[PDB]
Amino acid sequence: TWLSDFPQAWAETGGMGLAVRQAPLIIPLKATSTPVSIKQYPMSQEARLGIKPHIQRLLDQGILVPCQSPWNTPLLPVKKPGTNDYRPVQDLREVNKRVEDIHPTVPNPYNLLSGLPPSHQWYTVLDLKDAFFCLRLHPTSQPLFAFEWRDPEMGISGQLTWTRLPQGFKNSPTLFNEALHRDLADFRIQHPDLILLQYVDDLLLAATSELDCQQGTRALLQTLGNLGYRASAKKAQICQKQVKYLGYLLKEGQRWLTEARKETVMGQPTPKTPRQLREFLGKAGFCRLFIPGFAEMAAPLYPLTKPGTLFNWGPDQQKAYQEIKQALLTAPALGLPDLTKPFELFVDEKQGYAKGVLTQKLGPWRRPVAYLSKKLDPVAAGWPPCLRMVAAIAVLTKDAGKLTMGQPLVILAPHAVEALVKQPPARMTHYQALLLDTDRVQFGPVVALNPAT
Amino acid sequence: DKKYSIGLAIGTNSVGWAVITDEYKVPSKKFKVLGNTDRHSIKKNLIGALLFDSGETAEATRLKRTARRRYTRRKNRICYLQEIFSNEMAKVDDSFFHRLEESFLVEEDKKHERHPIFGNIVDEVAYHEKYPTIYHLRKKLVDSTDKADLRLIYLALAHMIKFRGHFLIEGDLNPDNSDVDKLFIQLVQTYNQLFEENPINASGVDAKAILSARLSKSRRLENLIAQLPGEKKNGLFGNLIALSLGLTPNFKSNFDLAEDAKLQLSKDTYDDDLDNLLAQIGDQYADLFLAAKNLSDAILLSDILRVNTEITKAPLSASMIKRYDEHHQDLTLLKALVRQQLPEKYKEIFFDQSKNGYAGYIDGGASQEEFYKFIKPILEKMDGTEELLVKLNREDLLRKQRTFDNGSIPHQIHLGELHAILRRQEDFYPFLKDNREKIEKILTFRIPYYVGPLARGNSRFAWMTRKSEETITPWNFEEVVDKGASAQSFIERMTNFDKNLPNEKVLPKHSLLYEYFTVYNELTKVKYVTEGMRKPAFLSGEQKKAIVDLLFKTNRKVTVKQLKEDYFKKIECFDSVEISGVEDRFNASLGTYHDLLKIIKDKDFLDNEENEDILEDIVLTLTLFEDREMIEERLKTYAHLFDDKVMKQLKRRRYTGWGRLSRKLINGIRDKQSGKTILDFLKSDGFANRNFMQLIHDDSLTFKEDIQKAQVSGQGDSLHEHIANLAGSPAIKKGILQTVKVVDELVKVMGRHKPENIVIEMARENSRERMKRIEEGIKELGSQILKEHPVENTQLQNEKLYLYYLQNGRDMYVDQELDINRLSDYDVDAIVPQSFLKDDSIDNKVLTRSDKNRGKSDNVPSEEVVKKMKNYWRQLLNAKLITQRKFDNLTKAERGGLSELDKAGFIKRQLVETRQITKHVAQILDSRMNTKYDENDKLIREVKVITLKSKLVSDFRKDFQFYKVREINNYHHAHDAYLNAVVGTALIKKYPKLESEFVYGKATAKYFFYSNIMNFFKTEIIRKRPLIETNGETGEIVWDKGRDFATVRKVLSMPQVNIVKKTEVQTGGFSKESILPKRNSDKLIARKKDWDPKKYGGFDSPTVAYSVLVVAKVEKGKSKKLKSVKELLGITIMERSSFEKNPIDFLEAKGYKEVKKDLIIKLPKYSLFELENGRKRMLASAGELQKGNELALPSKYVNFLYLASHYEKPEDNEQKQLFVEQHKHYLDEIIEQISEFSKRVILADANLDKVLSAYNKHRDKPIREQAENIIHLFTLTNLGAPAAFKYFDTTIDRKRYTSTKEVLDATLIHQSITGLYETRIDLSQL
DNA sequence: TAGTACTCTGCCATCAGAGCAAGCACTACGGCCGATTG
DNA sequence: GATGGCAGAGTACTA
RNA sequence: GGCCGUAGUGCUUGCUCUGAGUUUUAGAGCUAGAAAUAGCAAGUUAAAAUAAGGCUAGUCCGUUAUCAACUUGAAAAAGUGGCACCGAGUCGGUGCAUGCAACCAAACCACAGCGUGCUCAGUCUG
DNA sequence: CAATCCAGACTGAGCACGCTGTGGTTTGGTTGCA
């Protein structure tokens, strides 16, 4: 029923999008710059047929118009991680080095989910189709982007410039972010209760009750409809407790992990080459926030990653592999950090590997927020156990800052090394400033912690 | 990259090389092959040798150039005479000179009458009957007073002018003084008349026989003095006699003149010398001096004239006519005697031109000596031939007028005859009277040796400058040629430049500025000590000036006592003085200043500063010029400065010698900071008193910068120019250049990485001259050993005979006489023992009856023998039979003999190279190899250059059984280079303290260390050295007797060594200089363009520069068809320029048609061709080849041959003969190897069969003789031109490959200087 | 049979002087040059 | 001094 | 050992000269013989050339030194060629040669701290 | 009085080699999402 009410907001009915608020944008160039013409790189016959339907439909919408320009870049298809859609990418390698640089303002995935509060339990994830094509491109900068496409059936051979922001351009993610943010900035004011999360094109709406989400979704759809942006209706979770956003499951206000992601990590067999072991590490590392003490757990496999070495899968390496496989089977539910309340961090350090958990208050219990683990630098590796904990806290406290958004937090450790920093038995002065800043960090009552935590 | 070393050995005609690694192993790598053959790669060992023809000096070229100039000048003299005579010759006989020019012409070619003088047969026969010889006509012209034919007058004058005579005697000669005894009596009469105090009588003394004796002039003077009572040598009469006979006597003792007063009668300065002597002593002695001059003229004339001159004014012509008449009379008498006594040999004696005799003497080519040798037995075996035999013994039998002994005739005799002819004939012909002076000038004009060629800027040998541009003739030579400037240029173009200042010429040695510089340099490095002084002072500038002005300018030589008394005591007022740093007498002194002080007598002028240029000009003139005339003409500008007497004294005074420092360096350059010259700095430099070396090496001063700027200016020349400027033999210079090139090629080959060390070594290196030396010695000593038994030059070539003849047939150690017939029974003992040094020259070899007479054999001969025969050795030295060095070595016992320090030095210099040529080679190699500097501009020794003597390698070979035989092949050069590298590297690794004396960059204890320097190679010395050697203080292994000897043996047995013969384009003479008679052949070469060889004769055997491979078509047969031909053509030296100018036209002229410029290939000598089965041939010429393969005989066979042949002659020798006897069966294997190699390569079937037959017939001879003769057999299988050898009695001639047809389808190989880079061109495709 | 045409063998090659000047390279001789020990 | 030129005697193949 | 001085020897370069030697021509060969041939007579000297020759035209220069092949250059000159091992009859064989963020590893540059060897100056000792 | 016979140590400067800490470029890898 959502599609019928807002024909101007859904991509399946609203047609092509066009930002009716942002003005045409001129793509600037460096002072010492000259046009460069590069012939279209060879492309396989299977990859050529992938883009061909897109060119036919892109021509009808007016995005691609024939032109004669001295700039020319080789087109290149990039297939989606799924199926063989073969999305079109301009491959502006030379233009990127020639175009000017602007300060990026895109949000990093670590900090988006930190803004989501556990109070807002109802979600509505909307993803905008053909996001980068919404913004219009000034005809002055249109000759900058071009490519050679000759099809005898079409009957037109030559360059086809883009009237909108192309894909594969280095400034496209930044330019689309700012443009969308200004349009939705007016929406945020009108609805103080709603929490809007923006990731390039993906939008997430957080509300308190079911009725609040329903009212907010209609307002968001109406707002985006006038602005010209079109949201895909095939994949749009609306008024559902279970939503998928940023690759993370969101249920009961907890940052779960998708069951499919866990299957991929365990599904791979025992690695036999450094390339095979490298592939497995990254999957585990993306889940590192759920596995407690992941740095020490995957410690044996790290020295095998080196390009210059012999791949000897010894019993110790197999023990490290089994630990990661079993840990991901029973990965806990990381909670959404609440910025209003203060944070709590447990720190522990055994055998030169720092481990810990960032937790927050949940009733009478503590709920984990993110599991932090790191490898101590070799300079601190040789330190005595009393001094090693001081270095471990400093390393972990740096990691906690990237998730706590600078909010004050409490560092809890078994030992009482918090007084040791004041009177230790260059770097130490740097450590003193980080750990003694009462505004951002403090030490609570000294107490031990469970090994699992 | 791998560390390696390069070993070299340099010879006069061979430069071996070898590259080794750190383990003394020769590497090996694959080398690409270019060209068009199927082969694309080849493997070669990095060891070989380069062979080339020895270099030559420019002496022959200089002699040829001088001969050409002499012939040109003679023709110019004839042309001048003809130009003088032409105006009247036109009236007398117009075509006389034209007929004279075409005498060398056949009857058909002549454009005038064949008779050259008169033009008709009647007059020709009449003239030749009246005057059988030119001397008859000359005497008739001199004597007769009537009118004479102008043609005859010109003929006589032309003969006299063309053949003048030697210019040895300067001054003037009057032939009217002929008798010797009468003139001696007249001189004695003058002597008695003048010196009437004591009588002088020579009655009953054979003065003529004494003075005319063939003995030495000194011997004749001694005989005349002895046979004259009342006076002795060095008296007034003795000095007069010595001056007359030619010796130069000092007349100071005769008159207490206190000067040299030395007169030489033949010299041109005798006039001025006698003038000053007579001015000093009085005019009464002028008669005595004139009598002495006349006696000298008579003595020198009587040797050649031998005829009275009271009836004729042409003594030489009269003597020639007398010789003609005696020849006629003796010929008639001999003819009659032969016809009567012995008619069986008249035909062969007087008709056969092939054999000697009168026919071969006159018509044939037999000489006077050969004629005498042939006719002596015939004359002896006859009757009534006593006078003929006497004449033959006196060498006056049947003598032609023109003989080889006519070289003693001075030009003054011809001048006198010509003057007499002109005086007689000037009445009838006025032009002869008008041109007498110029004709005499034509006869007696010669270009001075300092003027040189009279070029006009198109000659590299000329230095003469002209004050005018007109043509130079003998009648305006003085008015055109600048004689003084020409002489100055002649001396200056050869003198050396300053080594520190190359740009400027060096100063004269006796220059006043040079003397001042040396005096101040010696003075500034002295320190005086007196009472009350804490530290010595340096005698600062004021004291130095006072000392110079009060000591050197007043006394010739300065002594320490005079320095202390005349200055320190008199002026400094310090009684106690202690000088330091100088000897008793100073070395340098103002020698020139004192000489001028006693002549110019002007101390103010000598001390004044503005005349230093004048003084330098005076000393420069005195040093430069040798002739009094040029000295006087140069000092004419200074005539105003000094009066005539002083000017004459300055002309008389003459200096010799040139210095080593330039005037610019000494005084011209000034320091930038204060504008002070080196001389001023020496005069006063603060209180440091620095000398010349300190001054030029001081960093603070700008002298070093100025010297470096001048030295850099001009830049080092090319490597070829450097080697040419080096001093040494041309063969050694060629070897050095080749060695540098092979070093560069090896560096390029080995990955362009320089070696760690370079080891080099160079070898150290007449009958008529011996005959002339022994003749001079015998004449000086007055002995008659040569008269007792004459000895030919070939006989004198024997060393024992030469020693016996030099020793005057007497023992050198005892006062006994040896027997010539009893030779080959005594022993020759060196003056210095052979163990101490290596020298086999005559200067060190002495022949004695018993070698035990010297006493101890380990030192100089005994003091008793030295004392016994010192007088005899001194007499021999004065007789020039022995040298000063030989005398000093012989008489060393009296001086002290050979001291232990001398023995140590002798044994040290044997193992260490000290030659300047080797030092220059090492310097060149070091400069080329190392060119990178350090942070302080100091050169980094990237490569070390080591120089060794051949003794180390020879001892290594002898000790460790690496015997070398030079007759096997040419691999011994490469083996020597490899062994040199190995030994040098091992030595520098074992002893790092010896880098100073080997690498370019106590007495008893020093003796035994140098003697046992090569002991670390040995195992059992009974001391047992460890098997593994170590450097000491380092963990470096320098030798390993377990395996390093095996490695050396393996390297020496490799069958592959890159032997390369350097291809050279032949240059030099066009052909053989002999002129053959006319014959019908195409091989003769015309001597002139218009002279047909078939009618005039010509040369033959042209020298081929380089062969050319030409593919063209020639016409063969009456059909004149074009047959394609490929052949080698020899481009001789004469036609090389014509071939280069137009090869197409040159080839087409020879008969070839449709030649191919692309297919034309230039082939120099020694071009290598590979035919089949490894058979190589080298192109000897256009139609000859040479062997081009080397036999790689096994080292076992080489060692057996050495041991059996006893090369270079108790228990150690005992086992060698036993080893040879055990290995007797090696001779058959060696013969089999020679035979198989010959069958595969040499391909001399008849010679091989003869050699095998001789070896089979001589199988019963002892092994020693058999091996010694088998060594000769390797001449059959050698590299190079075929040569004839001998096996016992049997002799084997050459097998010459006189065909070059087979090499036109072989493979032509172009080899680089090392042979590792090749370009194989297959000629079958062409 | 006449006429070229290539191969092998022995003979044969310009030689003697006289002066001058400059330079280098090596070999002996005389004289030095210090300090320490017997 | 030694090595290449040259004349002459000798033998061989083809028009 | 070093220096200074000298006496000698050898060698190199350059210049000015001399005597020969060689080649062609001139120096009428006679007689008896058809011709070859034979018998006698005569012999000593001179002219010209002495590297062909060249242009620069001089009373000049012309035999020393230098020179594997190919490419680029007028020329002077500059460039052109893989390594190791086992063997040895003139060398052979085998083998190799798109954008964003953070974290981990190799290597690179720069700086600070510690240990250790080489070069220069000074001092002392021996 | 006459004849014969430089090395080491320490101090100062330039390095040069090995190890540790920071900064920075670039290459591999890792995911994420575009």
PDB file of C-alpha atoms (C1' of nucleotides) in Angstrom, chain B residues 28-30 32 43 45 56 58 61-62 65 68-70 73-76 100 103-104 110 114-115 121 128 134 159 162 164-165 328 335 339 350 362-363 401-404 445-447 449 454 456 458-459 461 466 472 587 720 741 971 1065 1069-1070 1075 1087-1089 1096 1190 1192 1233 1311 1318, chain E residues 4-5 7-9 11-28 39-53 56-69 80-95 119:
ATOM      1  CA  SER B  28      86.834 -19.705 -19.264  1.00  0.00           C
ATOM      2  CA  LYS B  29      83.755 -18.199 -20.911  1.00  0.00           C
ATOM      3  CA  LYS B  30      81.800 -18.529 -24.143  1.00  0.00           C
ATOM      4  CA  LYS B  32      80.129 -14.934 -29.529  1.00  0.00           C
ATOM      5  CA  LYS B  43      84.621 -21.453 -25.688  1.00  0.00           C
ATOM      6  CA  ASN B  45      90.436 -20.042 -21.973  1.00  0.00           C
ATOM      7  CA  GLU B  56     112.540  -0.565 -35.974  1.00  0.00           C
ATOM      8  CA  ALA B  58     114.616   5.645 -37.728  1.00  0.00           C
ATOM      9  CA  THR B  61     115.265   6.345 -42.806  1.00  0.00           C
ATOM     10  CA  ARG B  62     117.576   9.152 -41.677  1.00  0.00           C
ATOM     11  CA  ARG B  65     117.044  10.990 -46.394  1.00  0.00           C
ATOM     12  CA  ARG B  68     118.704  11.849 -51.147  1.00  0.00           C
ATOM     13  CA  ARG B  69     119.669  15.352 -50.032  1.00  0.00           C
ATOM     14  CA  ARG B  70     123.307  14.748 -50.985  1.00  0.00           C
ATOM     15  CA  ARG B  73     122.824  18.973 -53.904  1.00  0.00           C
ATOM     16  CA  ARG B  74     125.352  17.306 -56.222  1.00  0.00           C
ATOM     17  CA  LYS B  75     122.997  17.720 -59.176  1.00  0.00           C
ATOM     18  CA  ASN B  76     122.503  21.356 -58.164  1.00  0.00           C
ATOM     19  CA  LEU B 100     125.746  14.938 -71.821  1.00  0.00           C
ATOM     20  CA  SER B 103     124.340   9.567 -72.269  1.00  0.00           C
ATOM     21  CA  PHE B 104     122.125   7.012 -70.489  1.00  0.00           C
ATOM     22  CA  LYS B 110     119.027   9.449 -78.461  1.00  0.00           C
ATOM     23  CA  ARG B 114     125.747   8.924 -79.634  1.00  0.00           C
ATOM     24  CA  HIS B 115     129.186  10.455 -79.031  1.00  0.00           C
ATOM     25  CA  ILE B 121     133.794   9.009 -83.952  1.00  0.00           C
ATOM     26  CA  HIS B 128     140.273   8.744 -75.754  1.00  0.00           C
ATOM     27  CA  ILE B 134     140.272  11.813 -66.847  1.00  0.00           C
ATOM     28  CA  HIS B 159     134.765  15.920 -62.516  1.00  0.00           C
ATOM     29  CA  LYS B 162     131.310  16.324 -58.645  1.00  0.00           C
ATOM     30  CA  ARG B 164     135.445  16.862 -54.197  1.00  0.00           C
ATOM     31  CA  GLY B 165     136.869  14.970 -51.220  1.00  0.00           C
ATOM     32  CA  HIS B 328     149.705  -1.210 -67.774  1.00  0.00           C
ATOM     33  CA  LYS B 335     150.156 -11.516 -69.855  1.00  0.00           C
ATOM     34  CA  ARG B 339     151.371 -17.073 -72.093  1.00  0.00           C
ATOM     35  CA  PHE B 350     141.938 -13.140 -68.915  1.00  0.00           C
ATOM     36  CA  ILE B 362     137.653  -5.542 -64.781  1.00  0.00           C
ATOM     37  CA  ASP B 363     134.562  -6.755 -66.636  1.00  0.00           C
ATOM     38  CA  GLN B 401     142.185   4.877 -60.441  1.00  0.00           C
ATOM     39  CA  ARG B 402     138.781   4.882 -58.711  1.00  0.00           C
ATOM     40  CA  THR B 403     139.043   2.666 -55.625  1.00  0.00           C
ATOM     41  CA  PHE B 404     137.586   2.368 -52.137  1.00  0.00           C
ATOM     42  CA  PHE B 445     130.766  25.360 -50.364  1.00  0.00           C
ATOM     43  CA  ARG B 446     128.903  23.166 -47.886  1.00  0.00           C
ATOM     44  CA  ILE B 447     125.789  23.946 -45.859  1.00  0.00           C
ATOM     45  CA  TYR B 449     125.300  21.411 -39.930  1.00  0.00           C
ATOM     46  CA  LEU B 454     116.931  25.192 -46.788  1.00  0.00           C
ATOM     47  CA  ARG B 456     110.325  27.216 -46.991  1.00  0.00           C
ATOM     48  CA  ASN B 458     107.064  22.652 -45.914  1.00  0.00           C
ATOM     49  CA  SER B 459     109.512  20.501 -43.954  1.00  0.00           C
ATOM     50  CA  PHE B 461     113.156  18.707 -40.235  1.00  0.00           C
ATOM     51  CA  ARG B 466     115.684  33.683 -43.848  1.00  0.00           C
ATOM     52  CA  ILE B 472     119.375  30.587 -51.806  1.00  0.00           C
ATOM     53  CA  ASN B 587     128.562  22.777  -3.077  1.00  0.00           C
ATOM     54  CA  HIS B 720     100.686   6.763 -28.586  1.00  0.00           C
ATOM     55  CA  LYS B 741      95.848  -2.379 -25.486  1.00  0.00           C
ATOM     56  CA  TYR B 971     102.621 -21.273 -25.249  1.00  0.00           C
ATOM     57  CA  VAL B1065     100.420  -3.839 -43.542  1.00  0.00           C
ATOM     58  CA  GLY B1069     111.285   0.153 -49.459  1.00  0.00           C
ATOM     59  CA  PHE B1070     109.563  -0.336 -52.794  1.00  0.00           C
ATOM     60  CA  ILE B1075     119.793  -2.764 -60.197  1.00  0.00           C
ATOM     61  CA  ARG B1087     114.036   2.931 -62.761  1.00  0.00           C
ATOM     62  CA  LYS B1088     112.540   5.940 -64.568  1.00  0.00           C
ATOM     63  CA  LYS B1089     109.295   6.512 -66.436  1.00  0.00           C
ATOM     64  CA  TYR B1096     118.021  -0.407 -69.418  1.00  0.00           C
ATOM     65  CA  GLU B1190     100.670 -24.803 -32.450  1.00  0.00           C
ATOM     66  CA  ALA B1192     100.263 -28.776 -27.499  1.00  0.00           C
ATOM     67  CA  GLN B1233     103.081 -37.035 -31.682  1.00  0.00           C
ATOM     68  CA  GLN B1311      91.038 -11.748 -34.403  1.00  0.00           C
ATOM     69  CA  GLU B1318      86.451 -13.179 -33.769  1.00  0.00           C
TER      70      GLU B1318
ATOM     71  C1'   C E   4     126.602  16.533  -4.368  1.00  0.00           C
ATOM     72  C1'   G E   5     130.431  16.252  -8.011  1.00  0.00           C
ATOM     73  C1'   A E   7     134.838   9.746 -15.352  1.00  0.00           C
ATOM     74  C1'   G E   8     133.238   6.257 -18.671  1.00  0.00           C
ATOM     75  C1'   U E   9     130.000   3.266 -21.626  1.00  0.00           C
ATOM     76  C1'   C E  11     121.372   3.899 -26.853  1.00  0.00           C
ATOM     77  C1'   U E  12     117.990   7.447 -29.342  1.00  0.00           C
ATOM     78  C1'   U E  13     116.788  11.696 -32.509  1.00  0.00           C
ATOM     79  C1'   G E  14     118.225  15.302 -36.021  1.00  0.00           C
ATOM     80  C1'   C E  15     121.755  17.832 -39.469  1.00  0.00           C
ATOM     81  C1'   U E  16     126.074  18.406 -42.745  1.00  0.00           C
ATOM     82  C1'   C E  17     129.573  15.468 -45.617  1.00  0.00           C
ATOM     83  C1'   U E  18     132.970  11.623 -48.322  1.00  0.00           C
ATOM     84  C1'   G E  19     134.477   7.071 -50.888  1.00  0.00           C
ATOM     85  C1'   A E  20     132.870   3.270 -53.482  1.00  0.00           C
ATOM     86  C1'   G E  21     129.030  -0.308 -55.748  1.00  0.00           C
ATOM     87  C1'   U E  22     125.115  -1.172 -59.560  1.00  0.00           C
ATOM     88  C1'   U E  23     122.710  -0.066 -64.392  1.00  0.00           C
ATOM     89  C1'   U E  24     122.622   2.048 -69.855  1.00  0.00           C
ATOM     90  C1'   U E  25     125.727   4.568 -73.293  1.00  0.00           C
ATOM     91  C1'   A E  26     130.704   6.406 -75.290  1.00  0.00           C
ATOM     92  C1'   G E  27     136.003   4.459 -75.675  1.00  0.00           C
ATOM     93  C1'   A E  28     135.646   2.178 -84.365  1.00  0.00           C
ATOM     94  C1'   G E  39     143.768 -17.295 -83.353  1.00  0.00           C
ATOM     95  C1'   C E  40     145.495 -12.662 -81.431  1.00  0.00           C
ATOM     96  C1'   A E  41     144.841  -7.797 -79.463  1.00  0.00           C
ATOM     97  C1'   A E  42     142.334  -4.729 -75.651  1.00  0.00           C
ATOM     98  C1'   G E  43     140.940  -4.071 -70.500  1.00  0.00           C
ATOM     99  C1'   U E  44     142.384   1.011 -65.614  1.00  0.00           C
ATOM    100  C1'   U E  45     138.006   6.023 -67.800  1.00  0.00           C
ATOM    101  C1'   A E  46     133.764   9.201 -68.401  1.00  0.00           C
ATOM    102  C1'   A E  47     128.239  10.848 -68.787  1.00  0.00           C
ATOM    103  C1'   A E  48     123.446  10.054 -66.385  1.00  0.00           C
ATOM    104  C1'   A E  49     120.214   7.630 -62.427  1.00  0.00           C
ATOM    105  C1'   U E  50     120.620   5.959 -57.433  1.00  0.00           C
ATOM    106  C1'   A E  51     113.999   4.310 -54.348  1.00  0.00           C
ATOM    107  C1'   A E  52     108.911   5.416 -59.327  1.00  0.00           C
ATOM    108  C1'   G E  53     107.680  10.114 -58.032  1.00  0.00           C
ATOM    109  C1'   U E  56     103.394  23.011 -51.717  1.00  0.00           C
ATOM    110  C1'   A E  57     107.968  24.342 -56.744  1.00  0.00           C
ATOM    111  C1'   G E  58     111.651  24.380 -51.911  1.00  0.00           C
ATOM    112  C1'   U E  59     119.246  23.772 -53.417  1.00  0.00           C
ATOM    113  C1'   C E  60     111.687  20.989 -50.248  1.00  0.00           C
ATOM    114  C1'   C E  61     109.259  16.035 -49.390  1.00  0.00           C
ATOM    115  C1'   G E  62     109.117  10.628 -50.367  1.00  0.00           C
ATOM    116  C1'   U E  63     111.569   3.408 -46.440  1.00  0.00           C
ATOM    117  C1'   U E  64     110.392   5.671 -38.549  1.00  0.00           C
ATOM    118  C1'   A E  65     106.097   5.313 -35.576  1.00  0.00           C
ATOM    119  C1'   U E  66     100.521   3.730 -36.125  1.00  0.00           C
ATOM    120  C1'   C E  67      96.911  -0.279 -38.506  1.00  0.00           C
ATOM    121  C1'   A E  68      91.483  -7.403 -36.291  1.00  0.00           C
ATOM    122  C1'   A E  69      86.005  -6.991 -38.156  1.00  0.00           C
ATOM    123  C1'   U E  80      79.355  -3.450 -30.649  1.00  0.00           C
ATOM    124  C1'   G E  81      79.799  -9.396 -27.732  1.00  0.00           C
ATOM    125  C1'   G E  82      75.357 -13.117 -20.555  1.00  0.00           C
ATOM    126  C1'   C E  83      76.688 -16.290 -16.084  1.00  0.00           C
ATOM    127  C1'   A E  84      77.891 -20.888 -13.291  1.00  0.00           C
ATOM    128  C1'   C E  85      79.455 -26.064 -13.048  1.00  0.00           C
ATOM    129  C1'   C E  86      81.635 -30.851 -14.911  1.00  0.00           C
ATOM    130  C1'   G E  87      85.574 -31.816 -17.966  1.00  0.00           C
ATOM    131  C1'   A E  88      90.024 -31.480 -21.901  1.00  0.00           C
ATOM    132  C1'   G E  89      93.982 -32.697 -28.172  1.00  0.00           C
ATOM    133  C1'   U E  90      93.493 -26.500 -29.857  1.00  0.00           C
ATOM    134  C1'   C E  91      88.011 -26.307 -26.762  1.00  0.00           C
ATOM    135  C1'   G E  92      83.251 -29.586 -25.562  1.00  0.00           C
ATOM    136  C1'   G E  93      78.841 -30.500 -22.823  1.00  0.00           C
ATOM    137  C1'   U E  94      75.141 -29.426 -19.192  1.00  0.00           C
ATOM    138  C1'   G E  95      72.107 -25.799 -16.307  1.00  0.00           C
ATOM    139  C1'   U E 119      90.718   7.786   7.928  1.00  0.00           C
TER     140        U E 119
END
